Each structure stands twice: as structure tokens, then as C-alpha cells.
């Protein structure tokens, strides 16, 4: 993995296109709440989804993740991330921040760049959650080059171009998401443009303080999606 | 063609041409000889000057490995010096052992397999040098030459550089003239003749000479360069043989 004469890298002008194939997901930064939302294969028959590895994953009592792209190269990070979580709670006696492990894993995706015979990932991820003993939301986005950012909304996947600009006709800085019913309406009113099917093809999750995690049924989705399946009419 | 690109790739002919290219590198170097006298050995070498700015007599090309040895080379200046720095510690790790100086067959048996090791692998450069050494042990006189394929044989005389064709036939013209035995001092005359006789392949340029011998008789079989009128006695002589 070397430098082209166009200031680029061959293998990494490539890799981040891999994440542009697979599933599509997003979260946001509500007024006082934070949420995620992702994708599933409807029509996957002869199967029980209780036990499949969810695109969501949890890392601590109070933080979670949502990958995209590959699935193998995702599982590895959670492990060595989990280590740093339930180790950082020990030596220093305080739990994590959000930026710490983000700063960490921002570094590991180049420790697996600059060496001999090591591919980078077909992975891009983001995180979300509230710091301990605070209230302000925090979410950070990642990609194999290591550059960790803080997007108020971030999506990686298929048909995502207009999705990357769909929010900008929808979100307002000085008009943030009021409540969950609208902020989740936001969470779904984005993703549904690529869904092209019912509720079965997705999975979502949410955070509130002091580790108030929830996951919502296929049926709870069929409560609210109808309300805009009713309001996609007038 | 396509097999002539790296070490350790034999040919259908049954060879690796790469070292055979090394022979032309050492062909691109200075003249150098060393003679088996009646009681020791001799060393003498070509040392060409480019500009006057080069100092005389501060830039020897002979190297010593231990007391009872002299060694020279021709071609690649550094590479022929490396194995000396291997030589200078090896025998030192042999006088370490039975507390006696080292034989000359001990030398090549502890060198002539070394350079071989730099022709087994696809990761190193064959020592593009031909090399001489000599001296004395309990047994008596010895002499040897090396070639970069590890080989070596006990000669009465040798030659390298582009001073090959002159000296070889000349020594053929010498030996029959004097097979009875040639003592130390006398060859120091007749040696420096040959270098003045062998520069004619490169008589565009200039040089100055450098000589060393070692006698069981004279110097207790120790190594001792030349520095004195004895050298000047020979250059005054060697001009006559070309006169």
C-alpha cells in the first residue's frame, strides 16, 4: 500500500467504495435523545431473526455501534473495543467517554494500514451515546482512513446519495427534533426511500441517559409507518 | 535471457551467468600479483592516480589480517575489504582455541566457503572480487588465489586485473628460466619489473607502486611492508627491463 503520483492510494481509493455497496443505516442527534436505524433482508425465508448478528451491537452499558460494509471485519473490532471499555473502567476507575474509544479505533484502522501484508477493512462504522454524568448527545462516524468526525446524521450504504442530501431538506439546526415520535419519524422518513418494502427489512434502536436502551418490534414500526403510509396520501 | 537475472538459478548449460558477469567487474580493475619465493611470499600491486591531489603513501590497498599474513585484491575496493574484517576476527577466534597461530589452509577453509554462502541465496551480492593471500606456518611456505565462485588453488604465482595476459605468459617465460629456487630479496626486484611491464594496457595514466613480502628468514616470518631505498633500488632496476 503506497502512494500514487496523484496523491492518492490505490487500495484505499478502492476500499471505501466497498461500504458503498452493502446495507444502509443512519442515526441522528435529537433535542435530548439519540437514535439509530438500519436494514434487513426481507424475503429471507426459512429463518428466525432472533439470533442473527444484528447490524446493531453494544459495547458497554451505555454505548452502541452500527457497522456497515462487511460483517467479519466488524466482529473483530467490537471485541478489542469491548476490551478497552471494560479495561478503561478499571485502571482509572471512571467509565469511558465517547471520544476515547473513538479516538482509539480511529487509530487501529491505520495500524492495519501501514504494515506488510495487511489489508484495511471493508468496514465503516459509527457510534452513539451519552457520556457518563452528562447530558449532551455525542455521535461519531468512522471510515478506514481513520478520520473520525461528528456528523449530526451519517449514512453509509446503497442509494445513499440523495439520502445524504434528503436530510438537508428535512433537518434544521435551530429546529432540532422535538421528541421520539418525530425524531424516529425522521429516523425512518430517511431510510424508507431505499427500503421499498415493509417493516420486516429493517432494525432500529435508541439511547437515552443512564443506559436507557430500547429495541423496537416489527409491530411498533407498523404503528408509525402507517401514520405516514396514511400521510403519504394527501 | 530470462534465467540471468538473479542468484541461484542454474542454466540448461548448468551455470549461473551472474557470477560470470562478476568476472568482468573484477576484469575492470587494477593489476596485482604475489609470488611463491623459496622461503615466503611477495606482494605487489598497481595503484593508479587520477589527479595530483591524491596523496602518495597514505592509501594502501594491501590489508593485513594478522601477524603472519598479507592479503591484497583487485576490482571492487570495499567488497574485497569486507571479508578481511571477517578474516581478522576468524583466526583471532582460532588462536583463541589452541593458542597457536593459524595455518593458511585454515584460512581458505574458513573463507572459501564463506563467499560460497553469498551464492546460495536470492538475497545477496556475490563478492565481485578476485583475491590473493599468503604467508607462513610451521609447515613452510604457501600461496593461494581466490575467484568469486569460491574456488582457490595453490599457485606459485598469480595475477588479476587487466594484467592477465602479460604476466601469465611472462611467468611461463620466467619459471623455466629459474626453477631452481628464488629467494625473497631477488623476487622483490623481478616482481616490480612486471607491473611496469604490465601497465602498457593502461599507459594513458600514471600510478605509484606498493610492495610487501614476508620471509621465514628475514622478518621471522612476520608481515612487513616495504618502505625504504630497497623499493627505490628496484624501480631503478625495473625501468631497465622495460628500457
Amino acid at each position: 500500500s503506497i502512494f500514487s503520483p496523484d496523491g492518492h492510494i490505490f487500495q484505499v481509493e478502492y476500499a471505501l467504495e466497498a461500504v458503498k455497496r452493502g446495507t444502509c443505516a443512519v442515526g441522528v442527534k435529537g433535542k435530548n435523545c439519540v437514535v439509530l436505524g438500519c436494514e434487513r433482508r426481507s424475503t429471507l425465508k426459512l429463518q428466525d431473526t432472533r439470533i442473527t448478528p444484528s447490524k446493531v451491537s453494544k459495547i458497554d452499558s451505555h454505548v452502541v455501534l452500527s457497522f456497515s460494509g462487511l460483517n467479519a471485519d466488524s466482529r473483530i473490532l467490537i471485541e478489542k473495543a469491548r476490551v478497552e471499555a471494560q479495561s478503561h473502567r478499571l485502571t482509572l476507575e471512571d467509565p469511558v467517554t465517547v471520544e476515547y474509544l473513538t479516538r482509539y479505533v480511529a487509530g487501529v484502522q491505520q495500524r492495519y494500514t501501514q504494515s506488510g501484508g495487511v489489508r484495511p477493512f471493508g468496514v465503516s462504522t459509527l457510534i452513539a451515546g451519552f457520556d457518563p454524568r452528562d447530558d449532551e448527545p455525542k455521535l461519531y462516524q468512522t471510515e478506514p482512513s481513520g478520520i473520525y468526525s461528528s456528523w449530526s446524521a451519517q449514512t453509509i450504504g446503497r442509494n445513499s446519495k440523495t439520502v445524504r442530501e434528503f436530510l438537508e431538506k428535512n433537518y434544521d439546526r435551530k429546529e432540532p427534533p422535538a421528541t421520539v415520535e418525530e425524531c424516529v419519524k425522521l429516523t425512518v422518513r430517511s431510510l424508507l426511500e431505499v427500503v421499498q418494502t415493509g417493516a420486516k427489512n429493517i432494525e432500529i434502536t435508541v439511547v437515552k441517559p443512564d443506559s436507557d436502551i430500547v429495541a423496537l418490534s416489527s409491530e411498533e414500526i407498523n404503528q408509525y409507518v402507517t401514520q405516514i403510509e396514511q400521510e403519504k396520501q394527501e | 535471457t530470462g534465467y540471468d537475472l538473479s542468484n541461484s538459478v542454474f542454466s540448461p548449460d548448468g551455470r549461473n551467468f551472474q557470477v560470470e558477469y562478476a568476472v568482468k567487474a573484477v576484469e575492470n580493475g587494477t593489476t596485482s600479483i604475489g609470488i611463491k619465493c623459496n622461503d615466503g611470499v611477495v606482494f605487489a600491486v598497481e595503484k593508479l592516480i587520477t589527479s595530483k591531489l591524491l596523496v602518495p603513501q597514505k592509501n594502501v590497498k594491501i590489508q593485513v589480517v594478522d601477524r603472519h599474513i598479507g592479503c591484497v585484491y583487485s576490482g571492487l575496493i570495499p567488497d574485497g575489504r569486507h571479508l578481511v574484517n571477517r578474516g581478522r576476527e576468524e583466526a583471532a577466534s582460532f588462536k583463541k582455541l589452541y593458542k597457536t597461530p593459524i595455518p593458511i589452509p585454515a584460512f581458505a577453509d574458513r573463507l572459501g566457503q564463506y563467499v560460497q554462502a553469498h551464492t546460495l541465496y536470492n538475497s545477496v551480492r556475490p563478492f565481485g572480487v578476485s583475491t590473493i593471500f599468503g604467508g607462513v606456518d610451521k609447515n613452510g611456505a604457501h600461496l593461494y588465489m581466490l575467484e568469486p565462485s569460491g574456488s582457490y588453488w595453490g599457485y606459485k604465482g598469480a595475477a588479476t586485473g587487466k594484467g592477465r595476459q602479460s604476466a601469465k605468459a611472462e611467468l611461463e617465460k620466467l619459471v623455466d628460466h629459474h626453477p631452481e629456487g628464488l629467494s625473497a630479496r631477488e623476487a622483490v626486484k623481478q616482481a616490480a619489473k612486471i607491473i611496469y611491464l604490465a601497465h602498457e594496457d593502461n599507459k594513458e595514466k600514471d600510478f605509484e607502486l606498493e610492495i610487501s613480502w614476508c620471509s621465514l628468514s628475514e622478518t621471522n616470518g612476520l608481515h612487513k611492508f616495504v618502505k625504504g631505498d630497497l623499493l627505490q633500488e628496484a624501480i631503478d632496476f625495473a625501468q631497465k627491463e622495460i628500457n
Binding site: 455497496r21 452493502g22 433482508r41 | -
Partner: protein, 271 residues
């Protein structure tokens, strides 16, 4: 040579009946038509509008349908040739003939031309040491040098075509000459939108419409086959004698024809 050239017989291909797109199509009318509407505007800011364009391939996805629609609209000449028909046994015959167009383009200020599938002319500059085939390479040089030796551009217009570019076409094209290297490929919805926007004209759908689900699930395909999709419903009508227009048998054609050309579908790996 002249015989094939003057194809003044535009079909009933109806420009603006086609429902494809706009921006491309203004881009040509802006390239061509509006320059023939009030070109003083180019003289206002002092513009030399372009010397024709080049679309790309993506076959069966709307290479030409506009073009004969433009011919239906052309309001000028229209020309048509083939390089394979242009070439001959002897040396420089066609090259001697290739010159003879531009004077026949010098015929008119309303001087325009389509060209037919260059893929055997000017493809790529192999050395062609292997005999014979240097004729092609000897011919393209007879054109491009003729094209821009010393030309006021004389409304010496052009529009070209192919099916694949990077397969060929290394150096022939140059900007200004052909500034607009432009595209046609699948819309990802608008085949659903305006294609049957056209084909709703004749048919009745004699029980319903059903069109709210006779639709695209981001299905990789080419809407050109939609003119099969209309077909076989009528046939399957008459595989069972339906003189009317159904929506139910219409199902099969996508389930039948779109199902043949299968893809790998290896996306049990990017989840």
C-alpha cells in the same frame, strides 16, 4: 456515396412523445436547436457553440430513439453513413470519399449528420504491424486532419455513437471539437415513470390500472424491454382469447423475461 447519404425520411418517431429526460435533451437543443433559433445570443457574449457531441452506449437503453425523433423534428438536412460500407478493397477509396462529405456538408449551412457505430473505425492505435488492417489506421488520420486542418466550422456538424468507449476511441475525440462526452443509461425509476407514460396511450387495462405495483423494485434491467412487457400481455390475452386488456397476465413478462438474465446475487456477504 451520395445515395445512402440523404436519408430525408424521418419516421413517426415523435420527439417529445418520448418520456426519457430533459437535461440531456435541452443540452442538445442548446447545442443545436436554440443556436438555430436566436444565435445572436451567442453573438451577444461572443460564443462559438460546440461542434457536435458524443453519447455513450449502455446498449438497449436509448441510444438512438431521440435521434430519429430529432430527424422527425430536424427542420434541416439529415445524413447517415456506415464506416463498413465506406471502406473498400483498394487504397484510399473511402478516404478519398470521406473528404467528399464535407463539401456535401458545404452544401448547406443546415448541415448535420448522424454516424453509425464506429467500432470498426478509429478503434485504437495498435501498431498494426500485422499487415492489411493499417488501412483503418490510414483512414482515421485522413478524417481528423481533414476535420481541423483549417476550418471556420461552416456548420460542419456531427453527432456520433458507439456501444463502448474505453474499448476503443483513445485519441480521436478532443474537446471543443467534441466537448460534450455525454451519457445514456438506466434511470433507476423513470423507466417506471414515463415509459408507460407513453404506452398508456393505446391500451385500456380493461379491469383496473394495477400500475401502482407493476413497478420497479430497483430491479437492474433496461426499460427498452418494456415494449415487450406491453406485448406479451396481449399475447397471453390471446393465449386465452382475452380481446380486452388485462393486468393479471401482464405479471409474467417481468417474471418471465427479467428472470432469465440472472445475476450472481452474492449479497449474503455485505450485511
Amino acid at each position: 456515396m451520395v445515395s445512402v447519404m440523404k436519408m430525408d425520411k424521418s419516421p413517426t418517431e415523435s420527439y417529445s412523445d418520448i418520456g426519457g429526460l430533459e437535461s440531456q435533451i435541452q443540452e442538445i437543443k442548446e447545442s443545436v436547436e436554440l443556436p438555430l433559433t436566436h444565435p445572436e445570443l451567442y453573438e451577444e457574449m461572443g460564443i462559438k457553440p460546440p461542434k457536435g457531441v458524443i453519447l455513450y452506449g449502455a446498449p438497449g437503453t436509448g441510444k438512438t430513439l431521440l435521434a430519429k425523433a430529432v430527424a422527425n423534428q430536424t427542420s434541416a438536412t439529415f445524413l447517415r453513413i456506415v464506416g463498413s460500407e465506406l471502406i473498400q478493397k483498394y487504397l484510399g477509396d473511402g478516404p478519398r470519399l470521406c473528404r467528399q462529405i464535407f463539401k456535401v456538408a458545404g452544401e448547406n449551412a443546415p448541415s448535420i449528420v448522424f454516424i453509425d457505430e464506429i467500432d470498426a473505425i478509429g478503434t485504437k492505435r495498435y501498431d498494426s504491424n500485422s499487415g492489411g488492417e493499417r488501412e483503418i489506421q490510414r483512414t482515421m488520420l485522413e478524417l481528423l486532419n481533414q476535420l481541423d486542418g483549417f476550418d471556420d466550422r461552416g456548420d460542419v456538424k456531427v453527432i456520433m455513437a458507439t456501444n463502448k468507449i474505453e474499448t476503443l476511441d483513445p485519441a480521436l475525440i478532443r474537446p471543443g471539437r467534441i466537448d460534450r462526452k455525454i451519457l445514456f443509461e438506466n434511470p433507476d425509476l423513470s423507466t417506471k415513470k414515463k415509459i408507460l407514460g407513453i404506452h398508456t396511450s393505446k391500451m385500456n387495462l380493461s379491469e383496473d390500472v394495477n400500475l401502482e405495483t407493476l413497478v420497479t423494485t430497483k430491479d437492474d434491467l433496461s426499460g427498452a424491454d418494456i415494449q415487450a412487457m406491453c406485448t406479451e400481455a396481449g399475447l397471453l390475452a390471446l393465449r386465452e382469447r382475452r380481446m380486452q386488456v388485462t393486468a393479471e397476465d401482464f405479471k409474467q413478462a417481468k417474471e418471465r423475461v427479467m428472470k432469465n438474465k440472472v445475476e450472481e446475487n452474492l449479497e449474503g456477504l455485505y450485511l
